[PDB]
Amino acid sequence: REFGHLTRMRHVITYSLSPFEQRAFPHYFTKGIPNVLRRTRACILRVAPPFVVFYLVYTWGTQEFEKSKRK
Amino acid sequence: DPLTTVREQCEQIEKCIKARERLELCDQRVSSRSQTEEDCTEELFDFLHARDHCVAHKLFNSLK
Amino acid sequence: TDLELHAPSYPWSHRGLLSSLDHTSIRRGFQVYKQVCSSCHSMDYVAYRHLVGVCYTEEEAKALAEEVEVQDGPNEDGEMFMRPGKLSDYFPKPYPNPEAARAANNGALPPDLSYIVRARHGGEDYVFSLLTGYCEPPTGVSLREGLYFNPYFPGQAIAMAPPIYNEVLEFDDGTPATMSQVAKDVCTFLRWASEPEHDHRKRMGLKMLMMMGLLLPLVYAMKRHKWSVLKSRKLAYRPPK
Amino acid sequence: LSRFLGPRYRELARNWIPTASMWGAVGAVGLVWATDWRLILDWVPYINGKF
Amino acid sequence: TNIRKSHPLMKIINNAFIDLPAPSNISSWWNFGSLLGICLILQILTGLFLAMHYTSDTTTAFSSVTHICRDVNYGWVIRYLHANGASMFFICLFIHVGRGLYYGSYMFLETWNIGVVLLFTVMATAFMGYVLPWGQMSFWGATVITNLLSAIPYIGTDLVEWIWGGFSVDKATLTRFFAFHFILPFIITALAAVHLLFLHETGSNNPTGISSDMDKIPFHPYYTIKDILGALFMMLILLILVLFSPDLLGDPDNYTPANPLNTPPHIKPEWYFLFAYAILRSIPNKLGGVLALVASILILILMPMLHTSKQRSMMFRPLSQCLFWMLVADLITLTWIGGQPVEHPFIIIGQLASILYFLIILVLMPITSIIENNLLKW
Amino acid sequence: AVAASSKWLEGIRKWYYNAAGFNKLGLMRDDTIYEDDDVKEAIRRLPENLYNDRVFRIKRALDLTMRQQILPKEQWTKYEEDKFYLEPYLKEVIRERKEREEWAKK
Amino acid sequence: RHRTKKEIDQEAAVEVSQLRDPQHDLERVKKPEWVILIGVCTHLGCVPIANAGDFGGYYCPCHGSHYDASGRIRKGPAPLNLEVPTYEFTSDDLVIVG
Ligand code: HEC
Ligand code: HEM
Ligand code: HEM
Numbered sequence A: 001r002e003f004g005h006l007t008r009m010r011h012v013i014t015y016s017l018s019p020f021e022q023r024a025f026p027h028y029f030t031k032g033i034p035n036v037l038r039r040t041r042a043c044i045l046r047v048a049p050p051f052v053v054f055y056l057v058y059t060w061g062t063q064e065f066e067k068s069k070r071k
Numbered sequence B: 001d002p003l004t005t006v007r008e009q010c011e012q013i014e015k016c017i018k019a020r021e022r023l024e025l026c027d028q029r030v031s032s033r034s035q036t037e038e039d040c041t042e043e044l045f046d047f048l049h050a051r052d053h054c055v056a057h058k059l060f061n062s063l064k
Numbered sequence C: 001t002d003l004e005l006h007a008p009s010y011p012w013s014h015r016g017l018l019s020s021l022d023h024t025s026i027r028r029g030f031q032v033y034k035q036v037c038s039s040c041h042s043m044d045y046v047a048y049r050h051l052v053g054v055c056y057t058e059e060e061a062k063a064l065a066e067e068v069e070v071q072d073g074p075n076e077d078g079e080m081f082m083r084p085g086k087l088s089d090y091f092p093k094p095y096p097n098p099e100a101a102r103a104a105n106n107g108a109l110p111p112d113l114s115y116i117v118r119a120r121h122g123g124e125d126y127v128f129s130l131l132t133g134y135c136e137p138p139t140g141v142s143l144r145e146g147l148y149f150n151p152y153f154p155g156q157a158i159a160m161a162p163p164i165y166n167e168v169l170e171f172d173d174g175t176p177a178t179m180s181q182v183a184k185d186v187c188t189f190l191r192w193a194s195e196p197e198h199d200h201r202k203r204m205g206l207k208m209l210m211m212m213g214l215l216l217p218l219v220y221a222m223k224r225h226k227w228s229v230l231k232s233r234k235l236a237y238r239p240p241k
Numbered sequence D: 001l002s003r004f005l006g007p008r009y010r011e012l013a014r015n016w017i018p019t020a021s022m023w024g025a026v027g028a029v030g031l032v033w034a035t036d037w038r039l040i041l042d043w044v045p046y047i048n049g050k051f
Numbered sequence E: 001t002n003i004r005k006s007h008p009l010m011k012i013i014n015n016a017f018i019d020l021p022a023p024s025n026i027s028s029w030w031n032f033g034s035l036l037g038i039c040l041i042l043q044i045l046t047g048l049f050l051a052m053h054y055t056s057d058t059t060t061a062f063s064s065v066t067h068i069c070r071d072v073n074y075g076w077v078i079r080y081l082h083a084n085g086a087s088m089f090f091i092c093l094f095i096h097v098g099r100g101l102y103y104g105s106y107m108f109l110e111t112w113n114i115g116v117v118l119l120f121t122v123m124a125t126a127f128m129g130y131v132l133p134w135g136q137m138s139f140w141g142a143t144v145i146t147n148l149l150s151a152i153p154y155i156g157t158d159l160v161e162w163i164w165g166g167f168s169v170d171k172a173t174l175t176r177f178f179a180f181h182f183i184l185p186f187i188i189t190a191l192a193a194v195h196l197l198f199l200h201e202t203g204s205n206n207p208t209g210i211s212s213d214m215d216k217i218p219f220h221p222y223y224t225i226k227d228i229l230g231a232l233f234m235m236l237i238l239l240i241l242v243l244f245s246p247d248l249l250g251d252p253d254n255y256t257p258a259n260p261l262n263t264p265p266h267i268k269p270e271w272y273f274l275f276a277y278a279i280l281r282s283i284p285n286k287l288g289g290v291l292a293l294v295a296s297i298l299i300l301i302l303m304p305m306l307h308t309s310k311q312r313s314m315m316f317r318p319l320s321q322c323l324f325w326m327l328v329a330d331l332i333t334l335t336w337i338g339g340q341p342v343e344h345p346f347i348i349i350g351q352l353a354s355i356l357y358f359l360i361i362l363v364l365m366p367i368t369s370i371i372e373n374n375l376l377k378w
Numbered sequence F: 001a002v003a004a005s006s007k008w009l010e011g012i013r014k015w016y017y018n019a020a021g022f023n024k025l026g027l028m029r030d031d032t033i034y035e036d037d038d039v040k041e042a043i044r045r046l047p048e049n050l051y052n053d054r055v056f057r058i059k060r061a062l063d064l065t066m067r068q069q070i071l072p073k074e075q076w077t078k079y080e081e082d083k084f085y086l087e088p089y090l091k092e093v094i095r096e097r098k099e100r101e102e103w104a105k106k
Numbered sequence G: 001r002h003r004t005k006k007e008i009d010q011e012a013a014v015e016v017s018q019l020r021d022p023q024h025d026l027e028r029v030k031k032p033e034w035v036i037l038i039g040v041c042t043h044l045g046c047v048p049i050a051n052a053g054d055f056g057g058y059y060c061p062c063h064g065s066h067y068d069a070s071g072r073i074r075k076g077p078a079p080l081n082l083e084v085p086t087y088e089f090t091s092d093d094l095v096i097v098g
């Protein structure tokens, strides 16, 4: 299971470039900030609703324990 | 001594007078008949909690 | 089924982040323990070797070893004799055994005072709020012959008798020896006994936030300049028509 | 399931329930000796290995 | 020639992490296995000095701990490493186990079964350790559990006398508990070179599901400089916690000295067993309770045989995404409940919360995956 | 099983197509299946023009993910232009396996 | 304990049916006026402060539990009564308890 024995592959090409010939942060605050947006957006419509429920039960339970002793 | 002066200064705010008003009403009813059940430890507890909360902000200033 | 009162929070001079313990409230706090608290409570883990550089000079507290001389054990032909005491020796314990305590103190063994700070909800503000609290019994509660009323204590009735009031002690300096300030300088002495580490470690947490600072955006730079070859590659697929 | 349904796997099962039965019998009896299991060491009074 | 290839010893490390195919899109959720590797390794070097200066005797059991804190040079540093580096170890382990399920990683039959054995083994080591310090919580956990394995149908009576090595907790206790809590780490560094030898024959998975042999990448230098950055970021968090606020996690009931007589007011365990304690306490009777506590570790095994789906992993599946988050939200309601008294209103939520841990796994994920198959025609 | 509701089954199927997100990477439904011993056979029964395409749709959509981006909106795989290329080769590897197994039973 | 007979009569005045676990002391210890006891409580194990109890036994504030003088339980959540130590009253003045 080494590199010369893995698969067979046809007519495709690639176009690399050196590390010492370019820059590491092309655009740091103009791409990353709109990026985090579409990510979180697309996904915080099915991660938040489950955790609202644990908050509603938490406040209903300490309220009852408190008023059963202190009238 | 400096605490003795500040305690009545910190009892001046109305956050602590109302629970103080509550303490007397049950206190006279309890002593009116030896047949009552309430012990005013509860109505005591509201008064000390409110008083000692407001004493905290200041007393360390009015020391030495 | 009885409720418990929680001590509030106070602005101590050693409260958070970077601030230390002022060694004058501690210098003036052993004495309040020494001439009031001690004749009942023990400090066995705490020894006179400890205070050589926190509150007193080496001979200044050495002279406190001669104030009381501890009983000794087996030596030649005349053992059980008395020795003046030296730097090594521990805080002398009051009774022959702890079982003597129930004899004189109503069957209530006094808690030790080495960890009393850490072994309590509250902390160094539960003890302070205990001291000034002692109050009046309300209308309709009975007590034993030897019990006292305190709305902070969980049972609301503690054997101990109020050991601080006005003019109890004479400070060696002349600060007004009042109940308000004797209580504070006891709550400071015990805390440092709970931890002797509280000041050495606040200084290794500031010289470390600086090594990380220098080295944690330089590994980030190497990492970023190996993945650029890999992050800027385009690709083909023209198949045979 | 359906890959294992048939008469041949039931036949192998009834053929090797000798194997499973002897395997389990030997294992159960060995589990008595291994842990100094007195509670079945007494069911036969013939092994007086407890001194 | 090439030295690494032809030497009989270098030939082995070259195939293991210098030069093996690795996938391109591996995320940072794949960094936790190596953190555990780092995490396991601290705990053996620390735990060495805690027995070298350690004294195994009954009379000094409380006093040996408070002693070592102040008297010993650099002892106050090293003691809180053993107790705080073991709450780290249990937060890189619920992240690792959770991650595999989401991306369908249990279709490695060999390695998902050698891992559920490692999960029981480290639970045991932790639960002896709490019981060494001895003080008025170590004793009052020990009675609770030790007593309850006496409700075995035919053997429970005979076992509590052997582990006690006496009628009950005794001087011998330091001798045995240290003896078995000492032993456990060294069986765990053996089932880890076997857990990894069954994976070097298929390689890693990736957060897509599909199988990717058309672009592999070496393992150097691309994941040996992403793995370093990860570990450093971790020493930073582990050190904010022992030089600023060490005591934030424990309980201030431990210190009270060694007394058989005294009554601890509010018994309760360390924070990472508080979901176990809420199960055992939820059901009437001795014998049915112990069965509901072994069920959970034993439930992970029924994993590969409940899979009903055409795709592997939840990345492309919206409906089954939502449940994931429910099982997790509902394992935060068993940590809050378990650290309080039985309660007037805490019994009803308290044992509604538990069954549901069971209902979803055994009934609702298999059914819901079918409606996904039927809804895009396989 | 329903007829007048088959408009609604179409409606729910167009919503679940978009909520799952393999079209923003260019893939097709048959690209996603899990490869066991029965799907590993039906792949080497494909002509060459069909097999070469599948190896480029799986390498361009596993590079967009190393970079945490998505393809432009004009190149999203529509709903009524997805062709099931690997379906017919897979009903046949299966029904030849129910036959070798009810022979050992009779 | 070198028990006082008045406390045995306090124990025997208990009505049987209300009791959570049937363990009468007259069969527990061959000596009513002596008792041998193990500290642990059947539910969890915590040990009371000495000389406590409204009814004359032991009081564990762990969960408001009250254990009887001879090793019995009257209130929950404690399952049963206190385990009886192995013993043998062989000598009248040199007891072998175990
Ligand atoms: C011999 C009388 C006596 C005196 C005088 C005395 N102590 Fe106490 N101390 C006791 C006893 C007795 C207790 C509690 C024992 C019990 O409740 O079972 C106690 C309790 C305490 C406590 C804990 C209080 C609590 O609620 O647990 C502290 C702290 C303490 N002592 C230190 C001190 C300090 C500080 C002083 C000076 C203000 C002092 N002792 C003076 C005997 C004394
Ligand atoms: C996964 C590995 C381990 C875990 C999770 C673990 C956990 C613990 C815990 C939680 C304690 C509680 C003590 C306290 O609260 O301060 C403890 C104590 C102790 N552990 Fe470990 N431990 C591990 C490995 C080891 C190893 C390898 C040793 C080897 C000797 C060891 C020896 C000790 C000793 C001697 C104590 C003494 C109790 C004390 O000093 O407080 N542990 N351990
Ligand atoms: C001491 C405990 C453990 C150690 C040291 C450990 C270590 C590792 C390591 C180093 C990997 C390398 C691959 C990677 O980093 O993603 C890995 C993978 C894996 N581990 Fe563990 N692990 C431990 C516990 C567990 C447990 C409890 C499970 C429970 C199921 C488990 C299941 C797996 C699986 C399924 C993989 C497959 C990786 C993949 O999906 O690509 N491991 N483990």
Ligand code: FES
Pocket: G041, G042, G043, G044, G045, G046, G060, G061, G062, G063, G065, G078
């Ligand atoms: S005796 Fe059972 S919880 Fe206290």
